[PDB]
């Protein structure tokens, strides 16, 4: 059988949720909210990839710790940081380095696995209760 509307099956993806069954994710409300306005984005990278690219990250200066072991501001290591509201460091998988990471947010089990002598650094915007008191100073970076 065919007319491809008698064996086909059917026309548009319905009889499928209501009364026949399988498939979509189906039957909805449910949360909805926030709008298209006050919305995303928070950029997030786990500290094991900065540890990939410590040795090859030779645009980030080494300093008080040995030459492998670098201060690096993570805001200027995260692709698509500039259209994001803040850059956060996530805590998965090891760090075997003596780094100094600068972030706009850090996890609590994000400092803790690279406790292994570190200085974990808030940027001014991490607070974010820090004084843009008309004044002058600090800023967010911009690039494509």
Residues that bind another protein (CB under 8 A): 23-25, 51-52, 55, 96
Q: Is 115 in the site for RNA (CB under 7 A)?
A: no
Site membership for RNA, residue 120 (CB under 7 A): no
d(CA 86, CA 104): 6
Min dist. Cβ of residue 133 to another protein (A): 40
- How far apart are the C-alpha atoms of 133 and 22, rounded to whole Å? 58
How many chain residues are in contact with RNA, going by CB under 7 A? 54
What is the edge-to-edge ordering of all strands in the sheet holding 105-106? 42-46, 86-90, 105-106
Of 25, 34, 133, 142, which one interacts with RNA (CB under 7 A)? 34
Instruction: Name which position in 79, 115, 129, 131 contacts RNA (CB under 7 A).
Output: 79
C-alpha 99: how far from chain center: 20
């Amino acid at each position: 059988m065919t007319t491809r509307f008698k064996k086909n099956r059917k026309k548009r993806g319905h009889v499928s949720a209501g009364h026949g069954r399988i498939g979509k994710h189906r039957k909805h409300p449910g949360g909805r909210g926030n709008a298209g306005g006050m919305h995303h984005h928070r950029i997030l990278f786990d500290k094991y990839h900065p540890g990939y690219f410590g040795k090859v990250g030779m645009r980030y200066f080494h300093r008080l710790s040995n030459r492998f072991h670098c201060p690096a501001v993570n805001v200027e290591r995260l692709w698509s940081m500039v259209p994001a509201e803040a850059g956060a460091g996530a805590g998965k998988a090891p760090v075997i380095d003596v780094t100094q990471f600068g972030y706009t947010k850090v996890l609590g089990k994000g400092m803790l696995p690279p406790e292994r002598p570190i200085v974990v650094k808030a940027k001014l915007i991490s607070k974010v209760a820090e004084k843009k008191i008309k004044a002058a100073g600090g800023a967010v970076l911009l690039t494509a």
